[PDB]
Subunit: 126 residues, 4 copies
């Protein structure tokens, strides 16, 4: 990623922020991929809720990542509210993917990414 390089060059220019942005994009992609993997499973009907949460988590993580990419300055921002929502979304999505992780390795990986992204986003709200 180029998060760190771009922050340093912004005319209004944060480790926790870099980590948050990087994780949001990673987690967005991972959850998009996890929704599609679950869709392809023989046991798709068991994975409805998980697919739905991953779609929401992908959507919210792209939004959060994008907003945070614009948060390199002191101006008022939705940033902290958005990161709190994102942390809650990643927590919910982690729990459901974790429940399937013994059965589907894609959900193990995705639960781990959601957990890390939850922590990164919560940490960026401090």
């Amino acid at each position: 990623m180029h998060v760190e390089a771009m922050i340093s060059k912004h005319p209004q220019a944060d480790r926790s922020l870099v980590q948050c942005v990087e994780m949001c994009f990673d987690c967005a992609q991972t959850c998009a991929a996890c929704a599609d993997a679950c869709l392809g499973e023989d046991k798709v009907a068991d994975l409805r809720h998980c697919i739905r949460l991953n779609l929401d988590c992908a959507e919210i993580c792209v939004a959060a990542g994008s907003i945070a990419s614009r948060a390199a300055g002191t101006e008022e921002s939705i940033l902290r509210t958005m990161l709190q929502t994102c942390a809650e979304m990643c927590r919910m999505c982690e729990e459901e993917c974790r429940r399937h992780a013994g059965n589907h390795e894609h959900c193990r990986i995705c639960a781990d990414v959601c957990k890390e992204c939850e922590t990164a986003c919560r940490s960026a709200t401090g």
Copy 2:
């Protein structure tokens, strides 16, 4: 829009919800357009913060609208948290567009849409 028609046909199937979804998409488009209009103004340098808020508001309203389009059932959802964030985003974006509304008619229109979308989203959290 086809929000109402699609909700009625969902296998797990709400006026406040229909209105929320419709408004989110309307408001997303309007804020995208307002950011671009402000970018094109001779006095663009006066509109930096407004452009930035409109970009965030477009991003959050698409996310909220999409999540709410998937909220026609009783399952656990980020929906209410996301709608609260969206209402806060629309409130912030409304205030800044309103400040420019005397000077730029596009901001008058956009402030009105943000205000309506804020109310719709807050109402859907009840």
Copy 3:
């Protein structure tokens, strides 16, 4: 929607363009809703491909709608290339939803929206 009102007030300011933008947002929402409806069907395993196409169609229609909301001027743009891609996406998604339309009313509605959006986007490339 506020597409028409916002275009008229843009400092660099098209019926076919208004119709395209309106349809993209309508179609994005409809396909998001159709993916979720299909996910909830008892016969979800029969709807894998349809769910996947609707997710792509929602993503591409939001992108197209957003880009077109920024296309009220004479500057170089990806607009026409993006609208061509969107028309092709809506054509593909229409065909699959149409195949399920006898069985699922949500797919009938969604196929009709995709068809209309395909035509609107193709017409805006002229």
Copy 4:
């Protein structure tokens, strides 16, 4: 990123594809950041077109990345059409950021990312 790990675990499971997805998300973030950096410059009025292209490039790269994250199987997809559009978008955005690269280091970085992402996406269409 977790692109490679998730592809390997998909029930329907490509170096060029992994590289494409990774680059799309990297490039999306970079262009979002470049739009915001340009918005913050004293000389913002000189950067209108560049800001606008970066907003389009961010939108198209997220869309492409997401669609490509769902392209780990042999089913019909918009993928190749979408990647061609994305390559064209990155080419356009590269050219404009490159023009500002001597003046703004953020545009140098962003032009380099767009160039790499253009190549990755074009290569994934083979």
